[PDB]
Symmetry: C4
Subunit: 328 residues, 4 copies
């Protein structure tokens, strides 16, 4: 069985037999900005070209219906647009007006009522197309998920004693000098199970306590923080000894959410720990040192761990043995 | 009695005798973007045309007051704008300036102080109108409620045993490969009641526990999740047996909220279960399979349920019978 | 003593002797969009005019330094800009370029290196000014606080029995067919106090329970909801009888927060109840009726209350008397 | 040991040996808007100039390949662009088209297929560059962190009795007449520790209760509020007497988060109290007075404190002595 989430945060999941694809067009905006730049840069170019054409032919049709084509050199009659020499000239005008470059070689004149209301309709719809594409671009340029790129998770998780309690720990970092606002950490245990009743539940999610009851899950994340899950009665890890752990088949998905200081927008950084990435009996190497009026983070030690003396017993047995020690 | 919320999420409610309609114009922005596209495409066209007119007449009035109309072919005097042959020419200029196409057949000149400050006033207000409409368009194009279109809720809810407890379950899905960020699930029971004191409360809302005390209500929603409400003492469903359920007249409104990964914006997807859509003694069909390095969701099974052996007793009686079994 | 918050939500507070006014310019954006439209429409006009001037003189200075003014009619030499007849012509050009209308009577030419890099600098800064003002406009046009205009609070609060408990109730409404997303209700009791130690605390805020422990404070607000605060031991209202209430000097500030469905933006609607707006022994008139497949809200009854049989005793004494009734 | 956070909110932390600098370009948007204006104003100018060049040479290359340069004065043949006299003329045209000023001295004509699709490609990419830079500007102009500038924290924290309990108090303010929406206050104690097991934890963060269990941490912040942390068994301050405090080496980081009323965007204001900024046995001076129908805040007293009779004992000993007083 392969992991549900990769160490970089992408999920190993494919959505198949989605029969209502009608839905992807119902929010087209979302499908567009979700697309790869290649697809956006293409569509943008296509959308622009078809608008110039679709109006360039309408500019040519009205030019043909009015009878401007017939005489192209007479004093008395003036066409809707001066200088429209053929099949392509209307295309340049259609651009001069929608991009509003309007070189003024191709100029509108009074003769057709049909012309004025078109230039109007164009300019109006010329704003609606241009906006949509710019809008679409800005969003895609400014989307938060990119910030996740500079949010890092320690490569392993560790289990070791902390003031009498066995803790599952992982370390988290923000590489930017800016802040993740309303930052918070949650974590899900993913492992298959079967209920007494027989129901096999493929990749069952159960939330792991990492501060939610005390609000310690609400981070102030400048220098890297070790996030710590205390293995108590309620922990999924309560009955797991050093010796059992490798035989367990589970995955902890670790999820960091907050807002990009600059754009108020919320991002989500993810990582994952499969059973072979949890080191029993280890500790995270310090990364902080105080040099001349600033705290210096040595990211060379960010992922680094070291072994310490640690019980091999499950937290449950540790407790039981301690409660009897007290009780003697 | 008909449902408060339809399976697609729209609410069967009409607001009548709203006497302060003065309020809808106090936030006009909101009424506009809430309108149907037909109404936006109309207004946009109207707003543009009236600005060109309202300035086109001011351009004609100043042109008339200065005395430019009188002589249209003399060497010495130059008008505020070259080439203004009649009632319509000013309209083209009024467009050439606000859309800033400015074909340069119609060009401004120095003779009137009144002209320069107008072109200024126009351009300034020409930005304020254009912005407003673009702004209005982008919003309406980029609004989150559309994402809800690709968020799905299982067609039925089910009640069946799970590790000794009777649970009310429904299944939820996200059809897009992108993430709903800070996703969460809440659910309200809607049913009429009467207090001891006589007060009849038409469609009384009471929240249903679906993870809020443990933070299990905060979803990591990739492949579909069965959301599970354990029917305990506090549940509205505590004293409801298989046999009573059909006689009950209640509705569970199910509400999913989160942020569209791309635009940081929060959306809300809704669905509803009326009493005849809750299947007692059923289970959701698995939708997950593991094929060659990715988890495959078979959405053909998304809504599908199957019958399993299940007590017909209310959870309350189940508990009572179990507590006595233990007590023997 | 006058109320801290008015029934419409504005706060009766003035900030005086703010000595660091340096701060209002440090976030100028915020001061600008907070200003009245009159001040925005003014500034916008001023900012535009000064940019055209400040560049119009630079266009005239370079025109003077190069020696273009001296000869205005010679074949061999061409100026940086054709047709600059005097002190004002440069101003039109300065507009033709920043608004990018560029009528092409005033056209740039090759003779000056100093000219090309200016047109560049202008256009670049011409985008930075135009953006800022548009940006500033859109925000101010699209700000959420306006939505609050269509969020309503019942005019009175009521106290009366509900299933054995004395409750403080108020009613809340949303006049729009759209949704407030992640809507929620909180309420603060404001009243002066003095600690045992002597410390007089002018307008002390203490939060009033209206659903926060059960998540009932998270609204699904379609038709109007009666928000209900149960007066228990923890309530500020525990030792207040019908007879005491009028002598009490307190204010309940009621605060509704959520996101405008269309623009993801969060708004806050406020209202207030002073001691004389709390009716003891009343109930809210129903506003819901079911007519032909939709629920109809009759907003004529929204604020309306009616009297019902209700104990005159404080909830504390009610409890005490009930606990002794049980105990007999 | 120097403070982790300064009184103005900046953090004394440097990120060193960040080896994956590849990441800063992966979200370039974020690095750009995070930069100083000098760097933005520079880049903006550079990006614009290189686009005009990169297209100005392509306009010159096609002009050279077609054979327009060779003859610059002949009747029969027309170039792709009229009036391109040399190495610089193409640059003006490249500007006339991307800024869409298009003075119409330099005008496109029909002769080259290669020209039309370029003008198209330019205009299309001319929108993508202009958008990006405007977008980048608006964000940077409109970023919330600036609002923090008008959110203030009292200069000291105080410890003194309040209705029988020893409290750690600090005062917070909002200088603007506008509201911070969904405002909230949290606070972290930062102090080094060593676990029983030996593990030294450099600047250990533990959250301090300031209202989170009752929702009193959710502010309605008009006039300044004294935020109060009750020193109970769970408080880090439980075993700290007046006499010990100065010997303690700890820092309370105080964090205020909410949304700028106008732009829905979330900001975070920070301040810090090191051990020598906590005054034992003091109280905050009132800042509220009621003058003629509005509450007047006298910010001259905002930071001001005064001494009051206060026990010198740790809250723990205070409790113990009180519990024995009751027990006698
Ligand atoms: C032709 O070149 C276009 C060029 C690169 O973009 P290109 O087409 O190679 O595609 C991008 C690339 O696949 C990234 O890895 C994607 O991020 P993720 O891995 O999907 O997160 C990104 O999507 P988003 O995530 O940025 O939308 C894609 O846009 O863009 C200038
Ligand atoms: C003339 O054609 C205009 C064309 C279609 O739009 P059209 O006028 O048919 O109206 C849309 C249609 O009614 C959708 O069903 C609406 O969604 P919902 O059902 O109300 O959610 C939508 O509102 P919103 O929800 O998109 O604002 C409406 O705009 O738009 C291009
Ligand atoms: C000259 O006319 C300008 C015209 C009206 O605007 P005007 O200058 O009369 O001022 C508006 C008016 O005072 C509103 O009552 C304000 O709302 P609030 O009461 O302060 O909430 C509003 O502020 P905001 O709240 O909209 O920023 C003000 O802008 O705008 C077109
Ligand atoms: C050349 O002048 C450019 C001029 C001033 O900007 P300038 O280059 O001096 O730099 C700004 C200055 O350093 C502020 O103190 C910064 O705020 P903070 O202290 O870093 O918070 C600000 O960053 P941000 O925080 O505004 O991005 C900087 O942009 O801008 C018009
Ligand atoms: K909690
Ligand atoms: K909770
Ligand atoms: K809670
Ligand atoms: K233009
Ligand atoms: K133009
Ligand atoms: K032009
Ligand atoms: K022109
Ligand atoms: K809580
Ligand atoms: Na950081
Ligand atoms: Na998904
Ligand atoms: Na509503
Ligand atoms: Na304020």
């Amino acid at each position: 069985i392969q992991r549900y989430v990769r160490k970089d945060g992408k999920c190993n999941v494919h959505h198949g037999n989605v029969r209502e694809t009608y839905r992807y067009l119902t929010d087209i905006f979302t499908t567009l900005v979700d697309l790869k730049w290649r697809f956006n840069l293409l569509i943008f170019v296509m959308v622009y070209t078809v608008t110039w054409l679709f109006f360039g032919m309408i500019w040519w049709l009205i030019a043909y219906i009015r009878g401007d084509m017939d005489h192209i050199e007479d004093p008395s009659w003036t066409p809707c647009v001066t200088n429209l020499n053929g099949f392509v000239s209307a295309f340049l005008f259609s651009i001069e007006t929608e991009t509003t470059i309007g070189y003024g070689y191709r100029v509108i004149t009074d003769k057709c009522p049909e012309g004025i209301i078109l230039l109007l309709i164009q300019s109006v719809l010329g704003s609606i197309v241009n906006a949509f594409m710019v809008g679409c671009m800005f969003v895609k340029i400014s989307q938060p998920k990119k910030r996740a790129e500079t949010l890092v998770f320690s490569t392993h998780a560790v289990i070791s004693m902390r003031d009498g309690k066995l803790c599952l720990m992982f370390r988290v970092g923000d590489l930017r000098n800016s802040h993740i606002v309303e930052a918070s950490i949650r974590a899900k245990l993913i492992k298959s199970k079967q209920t007494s009743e027989g129901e096999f539940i493929p990749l069952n999610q159960t939330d792991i306590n990492v501060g939610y009851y005390t609000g310690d899950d609400r981070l102030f994340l400048v220098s890297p923080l070790i996030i710590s899950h205390e293995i108590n009665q309620q922990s999924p890890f309560w009955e797991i000894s050093k010796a059992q752990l490798p035989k367990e088949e589970l995955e902890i998905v670790v999820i960091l959410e907050g807002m990009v200081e600059a754009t108020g927008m919320t991002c989500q950084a993810r990582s994952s720990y499969i059973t072979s990435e949890i080191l029993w009996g280890y500790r995270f190497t310090p990364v902080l040192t105080l040099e001349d009026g600033f705290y210096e983070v040595d990211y060379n030690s960010f992922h680094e761990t070291y072994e310490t003396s640690t019980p091999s017993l499950s937290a449950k047995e540790l407790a039981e043995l301690a409660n009897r020690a007290e009780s003697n």
